[PDB]
Nucleic acid binder design. Structure first.
Lengths: 108, 108, 105, 105
DNA sequence: TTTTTTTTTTTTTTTTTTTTTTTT
DNA sequence: TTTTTTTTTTTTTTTTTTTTTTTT
């Protein structure tokens, strides 16, 4: 089933690069994407979407090398549903974006 | 900032159509989108993304009239970050998709 | 069948706007969007896709009041295959983008 | 500049595959994707966009082994503007889609 | 297949063409 | 601008064309 996400945002923190026990690079970036919209009066408003994106392999390292907090970037990937047991034994779930590619937007 | 979601999925429940105190129609649908992928062995796996989509106005009613539990549909919209205080006074947040359009996929 | 196009490009000429009998606007814009690829035997390349986009209603109006040659815009829409005949009966064809929306940066 | 195309279409002819000097595959497919619009003065209309897509590497191979005239597929890629000259020097142009990926239903 | 927590302009219709070195 | 909780096939390169009535 087709699952596609395309978002332009800026990092809310520096990218955190790690290696998984397996050897694969992994990274998670925090994105903030804002939208403007007119209120039924004439007021202009804003919604800010905060969301984490998962990176793996070469993509994770590319992100760690070229992006930093505040960086602007276009991310392309899929929507992800994470479901797991925390160390307390409590069921927990999460929605993240698993990114396939990044389009750097810092150069102006 | 560009914020786009395009997902094909099936409803996990019947669409729940309501009117907001303002008069606007609103509806929320539960989607399930599954992905298949090969495991580093040769096993084929699956991830299932469960996610809610918000509909408003004519879109909400269109959904309520033509879609039901198990229905296949293509949704196009944006990623949304919901943040609010529950009736207990506790901070709560959520990621949903706010849908702009629906492409029906039940007719075969 | 799903048909989506999302592209960022600069206008290659000014907006051309007319009005239909119904009264709704209809404009056409010329776009240019480039891609860099330092992928080749050795060095860096550049490809530019030139293409026209059809605009309708209030979108065509917004394009007409705010865009001009050189402007950068993001458009969403679908791919369109246009065909017709010459005054000499020679049938012609063409691909364009029919935009649903516009976002200017 | 961002350049995205996502389209579902049926193949209008069989897959045409060759191999480049490097050894990687390169195929071309003809697509047709239709849109319904019961929007007009009164009744229902239908438009079909015909367009060719360029495939490379293993994607071209998968297209060659599993697709044929009539097959339905979802392709992702970008819009491409191709140009060249006649043997008589007449310069030609063309729009195609260069696919990054393929998904067959 | 992979872990586990606030960044910094608007929203069916007709027509028939030549141009504004950050990774991948 | 808007509420508040498990559905049912694979993943820089060259070439130069005519076809497989669910809403919007």
């Amino acid at each position: 089933m087709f699952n596609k996400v395309i978002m332009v945002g800026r990092l809310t923190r520096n990218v955190e690069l790690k290696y998984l026990p397996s050897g694969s690079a992994a990274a998670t970036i925090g994105l903030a994407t804002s939208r403007r919209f007119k209120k039924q009066d004439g007021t202009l408003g804003e919604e800010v979407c905060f969301i984490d994106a998962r990176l793996f392999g070469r993509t994770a390292e590319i992100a760690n090398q070229y992006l930093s907090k505040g960086s602007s970037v276009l991310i392309e990937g899929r929507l992800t549903y994470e479901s797991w047991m925390d160390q307390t034994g409590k069921k927990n779930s999460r929605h993240t974006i698993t990114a396939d590619s990044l389009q750097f937007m810092d150069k102006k």
